[PDB]
Amino acid sequence: ENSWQIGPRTLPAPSGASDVLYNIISKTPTPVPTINLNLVPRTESEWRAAITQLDEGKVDMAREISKQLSVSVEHGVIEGVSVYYVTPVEVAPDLEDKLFVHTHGGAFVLNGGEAGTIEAIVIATLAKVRVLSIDYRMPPSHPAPAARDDVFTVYQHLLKQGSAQKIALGGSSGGANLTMGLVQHLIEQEVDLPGALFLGTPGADMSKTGDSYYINDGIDRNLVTYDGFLEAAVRLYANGRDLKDPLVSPLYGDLHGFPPTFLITGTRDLLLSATVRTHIKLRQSGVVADLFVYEGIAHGDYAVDLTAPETQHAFAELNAFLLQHLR
Amino acid sequence: ENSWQIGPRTLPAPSGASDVLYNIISKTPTPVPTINLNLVPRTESEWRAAITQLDEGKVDMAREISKQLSVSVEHGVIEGVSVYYVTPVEVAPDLEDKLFVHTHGGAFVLNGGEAGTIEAIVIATLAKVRVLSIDYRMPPSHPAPAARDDVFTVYQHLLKQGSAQKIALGGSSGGANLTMGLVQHLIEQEVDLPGALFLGTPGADMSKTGDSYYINDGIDRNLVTYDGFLEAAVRLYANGRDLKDPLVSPLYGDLHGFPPTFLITGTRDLLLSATVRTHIKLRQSGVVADLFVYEGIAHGDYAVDLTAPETQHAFAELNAFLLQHLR
Numbered sequence: 104e105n106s107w108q109i110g111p112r113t114l115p116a117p118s119g120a121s122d123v124l125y126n127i128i129s130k131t132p133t134p135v136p137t138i139n140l141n142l143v144p145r146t147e148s149e150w151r152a153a154i155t156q157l158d159e160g161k162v163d164m165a166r167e168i169s170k171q172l173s174v175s176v177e178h179g180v181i182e183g184v185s186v187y188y189v190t191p192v193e194v195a196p197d198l199e200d201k202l203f204v205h206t207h208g209g210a211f212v213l214n215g216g217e218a219g220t221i222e223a224i225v226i227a228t229l230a231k232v233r234v235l236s237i238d239y240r241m242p243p244s245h246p247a248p249a250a251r252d253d254v255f256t257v258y259q260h261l262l263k264q265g266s267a268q269k270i271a272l273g274g275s276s277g278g279a280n281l282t283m284g285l286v287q288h289l290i291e292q293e294v295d296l297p298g299a300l301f302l303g304t305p306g307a308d309m310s311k312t313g314d315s316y317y318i319n320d321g322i323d324r325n326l327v328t329y330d331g332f333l334e335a336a337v338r339l340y341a342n343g344r345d346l347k348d349p350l351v352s353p354l355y356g357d358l359h360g361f362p363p364t365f366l367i368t369g370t371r372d373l374l375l376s377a378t379v380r381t382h383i384k385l386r387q388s389g390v391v392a393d394l395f396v397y398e399g400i401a402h403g404d405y406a407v408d409l410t411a412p413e414t415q416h417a418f419a420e421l422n423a424f425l426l427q428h429l430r
Numbered sequence: 431e432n433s434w435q436i437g438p439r440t441l442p443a444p445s446g447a448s449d450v451l452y453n454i455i456s457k458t459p460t461p462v463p464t465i466n467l468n469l470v471p472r473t474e475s476e477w478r479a480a481i482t483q484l485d486e487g488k489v490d491m492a493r494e495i496s497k498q499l500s501v502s503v504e505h506g507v508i509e510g511v512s513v514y515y516v517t518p519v520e521v522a523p524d525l526e527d528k529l530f531v532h533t534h535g536g537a538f539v540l541n542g543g544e545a546g547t548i549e550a551i552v553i554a555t556l557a558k559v560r561v562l563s564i565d566y567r568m569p570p571s572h573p574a575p576a577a578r579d580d581v582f583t584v585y586q587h588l589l590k591q592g593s594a595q596k597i598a599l600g601g602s603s604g605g606a607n608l609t610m611g612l613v614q615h616l617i618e619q620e621v622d623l624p625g626a627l628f629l630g631t632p633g634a635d636m637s638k639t640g641d642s643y644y645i646n647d648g649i650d651r652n653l654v655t656y657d658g659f660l661e662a663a664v665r666l667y668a669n670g671r672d673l674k675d676p677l678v679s680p681l682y683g684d685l686h687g688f689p690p691t692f693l694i695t696g697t698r699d700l701l702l703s704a705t706v707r708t709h710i711k712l713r714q715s716g717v718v719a720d721l722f723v724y725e726g727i728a729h730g731d732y733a734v735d736l737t738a739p740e741t742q743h744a745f746a747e748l749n750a751f752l753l754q755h756l757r
């Protein structure tokens with residue numbers, strides 16, 4: 104109760120953002136925290152229903168972007184793990200022998216299958232690099248650490264094929280969580296590390312620790328609130344582990360030895376704190392880490408409209424970051 | 431009215447911050463907007479009283495830190511401009527021939543005289559570099575562009591003595607504003623630029639534009655709110671100019687050609703948006719710009735307690751930043 108009671112605030116669309124983002128936000132209704140507050144699956148069957156509902160239309164969006172941008176998206180399997188090969192029409196000359204291994208976002212149970220390729224498609228086209236998106240097994244059907252295992256399995260296979268230094272690894276939210284956890288494991292096991300990491304709005308701390316969980320409650324148009332669904336998803340993922348257990352919230356683990364890391368979030372992101380806390384911990388641990396925070400941007404909004412100047416800039420920066428660090 | 435109405439929120443002290451910062455925040459009472467809402471000087475006499483009131487105790491803190499850290503703070507005059515030579519006991523070997531020219535924060539009327547040396551002392555001692563803090567003339571007695579002129583006068587004098595490349599320039603809030611405006615002037619006039627800039631919580635856009643003005647209203651324990659005093663101070667500074675005039679809000683000006691820039695802010699900063707929008711605009715303009723956002727930190731909180739790990743880290747990064755860019 105040493106906490107602050109903040110009165111109601113009024114939040115206008117941000118004229119500081121691009122016209123594209125300003126218009127997106129301006130057309131977004133005030134986020135409604137009761138939906139996510141009331142979406143609390145308890146049974147595996149309720150989970151399957153919630154998940155389907157939340158994933159609705161994702162595949163359609165993915166294919167639409169793919170067709171429009173001439174991105175090839177092809178399902179395959181690597182050592183039993185579902186993957187998607189995502190090839191853009193233009194691969195940067197110096198990224199021609201490089202690979203971006205992508206781990207999709209969503210809160211640990213979302214974006215299975217082709218639904219998870221949206222961000223991979225964005226990265227592929229705009230960062231001009233081939234992407235391999237890992238369709239890792241998720242709860243409720245496949246409790247942790249099935250997802251962790253899948254990412255590790257694909258990564259190990261890739262190292263049989265070529266140098267880890269030519270590989271970038273990452274993604275957003277829950278996938279960024281697996282990415283951080285994987286890298287920590289690799290460092291422990293003295294396995295070769297990726298040449299670079301991408302952590303977009305990472306689910307780095309899934310306990311309700313972080314200013315933005317409180318400050319941006321009702322302000323992040325996508326996650327809206329930690330309470331209800333997100334916490335339930337986190338707890339499903341945690342599978343009995345403490346939420347500050349580094350296996351659940353990798354921010355609490357050691358970040359020394361991390362490859363150069365690129366992080367992105369925005370002023371309205373519920374995971375803004377998770378992101379900047381991670382960026383700071385990386386820097387404090389002697390890691391090259393570049394942070395980008397976009398005015399107006401909520402969780403994942405940097406990869407929702409390819410015409411946003413924010414998005415075009417962000418991935419042009421990612422491209423430059425991959426050119427600098429991958430070899 | 432395309433705005434979102436956000437319900438009241440509860441903001442606990444941030445466990446993700448350092449213990450030092452957590453205890454500082456935890457001991458800070460809920461910010462109270464009404465005070466700054468009611469502090470609205472209209473007359474020059476009322477300004478002088480408001481300013482005196484707000485500056486109260488600053489010199490004492492400056493002197494206390496100085497003594498405690500063995501920092502020499504010496505008043506002088508350069509071409510008629512009041513300055514403070516701030517010399518730390520330890521200057522980094524490769525910063526021995528370098529100089530950090532500091533422009534104090536406060537909202538355009540505050541921290542005159544020795545009161546302005548606090549951040550200079552923190553920078554000098556933690557970044558291990560000599561600081562020359564410019565005590566520029568401010569409203570109400572000296573309307574803009576007196577401050578602008580004073581900073582330019584000192585800078586021009588310094589270029590007569592040595593290479594601009596050996597000089598870093600910057601500070602926070604209002605001073606950061608002058609810094610941005612000065613560099614834009616220098617670029618226009620084809621004058622040699624500093625080797626590096628420091629923009630802490632910059633007053634880069636002083637119109638009420640920026641998510642953080644709204645999101646962090648009542649959450650920044652220092653500025654608290656834009657309404658009332660801060661707006662009054664901005665308008666006094668503007669002196670009839672539009673608040674988006676680049677001479678008032680340099681974010682709106684051209685940032686191409688800027689030297690490498692180091693920016694710092696935090697999750698609770700009312701000027702978080704000003705900061706990240708500047709960082710993004712700099713990066714979009716081909717400028718080297720490194721952003722640091724600290725969980726829990728509000729306007730200027732990165733230079734308020736030298737024992738905070740946030741502060742120690744931030745200025746160790748600044749040190750590394752100056753070592754890389756000054757030559």
Ligand code: NA
Binds near residue numbers: 397706707709
């Ligand atoms: Na930024």
Ligand code: NA
Binds near residue numbers: 535
């Ligand atoms: Na001031």
Ligand code: NA
Binds near residue numbers: 541542
């Ligand atoms: Na002054």
Ligand code: NA
Binds near residue numbers: 378380382723724
């Ligand atoms: Na940060």
